[PDB]
Amino acid sequence: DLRSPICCILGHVDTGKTKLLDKIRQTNVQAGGITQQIGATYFPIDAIKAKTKVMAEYEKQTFDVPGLLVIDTPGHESFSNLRSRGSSLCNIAILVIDIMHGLEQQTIESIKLLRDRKAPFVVALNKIDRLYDWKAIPNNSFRDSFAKQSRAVQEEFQSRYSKIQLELAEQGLNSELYFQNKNMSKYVSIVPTSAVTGEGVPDLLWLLLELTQKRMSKQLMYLSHVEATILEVKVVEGFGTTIDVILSNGYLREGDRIVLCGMNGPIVTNIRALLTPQPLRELRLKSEYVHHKEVKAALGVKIAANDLEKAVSGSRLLVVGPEDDEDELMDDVMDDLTGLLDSVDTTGKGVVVQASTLGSLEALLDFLKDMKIPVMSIGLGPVYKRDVMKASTMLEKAPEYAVMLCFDVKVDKEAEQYAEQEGIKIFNADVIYHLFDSFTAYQEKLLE
Ligand SMILES: Nc1nc2c(ncn2[C@@H]2O[C@H](COP(=O)(O)OP(=O)(O)O)[C@@H](O)[C@H]2O)c(=O)[nH]1
């Protein structure tokens, strides 16, 4: 019937997003069936019902979708694919904000990322239990526990919340509590949360269900064509190169013929194995993985197959069924990469760019297009000496354009030394915006 929605959690360090995730993950004693998958964890709808029971006191409950899928992996893997395709990787985003700290640098970074991404999101106001002399009711709804609290506590909460709402107003986005908010489009919804007590978690889950079911009912339907995107390319012993992928829709089976985007060219291979993590320590001891002859959306799965090393993160994966043309499909999957590649001119004066994923590369090229800096070549995966040579060619005619913009990429020591001696400039940042700031700083420092 319906397709399970995908949730992603992003916040400044020590906000409690991991702890919150663990609280939601917590085994329910009554339900159950929550499985840790590769790059994600899945919650069956019954477990959510069990967790969202108290929300019956304030809101109408709907449980149409089979489950909720959230992404465990730290960072921004949920945005490794193109923004148009982005809906597949992340239906809704959870921005965790410490009610104590309020807005922080990584928070503003994440906000800007979401605005560029045009991705819908809600904010979780975590650490509310830390409010002075807060009396906690484990796993209670927010409004109930708030009503339970003393006037002093309510006033402290109101002060901090008002401050944070003001800070969000500074970033240009209007914010309101989820029940108070009239329109989701204009106002972002705040749900106060405590990852330790579990307070607000029912509100959060209910809100996710509401937004995803109502707004994304349109977005999430069942499709017989496969829908999947590669979160990561990782090397696992006994399998060589494997790809960790989120299967948003459809069925994947062993022995399937699949085509995926690759740096040099399109990759075609047959699935040798479909793998999921194994919870039981005793069984995990024999083998770290469980094999599935067939796998059904929505879940995060590790795919083992030939020629996976060339694979690019963020790329969509297509299965050629009978009556389908594999070559046509290769062009189809490659279309995003080619689409980005064309924007760069192999012939002309430009800078060199290297990125980890398609989405990061997209954001980079968008930034350069805005700043009007031309790009001669595009790079994916680890930086090598040749990639630096590409920039080295620019040195004779234009010293200023002989630079490398690299995001979330690993640079070889040989490449590092070569660039060091040659005088090429390499920009590398964990955060995409850090690279923007440092780069503009470099341009203005060369401008003087
Ligand atoms: N009191 C309280 N502490 C929290 C809450 N959420 C997180 N913490 C604390 O914050 C510390 C670090 O949080 P962590 O989950 O590692 O943040 P993350 O790495 O950004 O996900 C942990 O030791 C938690 O005890 C909360 O809701 N209430």
Ligand SMILES: [Mg+2]
């Ligand atoms: Mg963490």
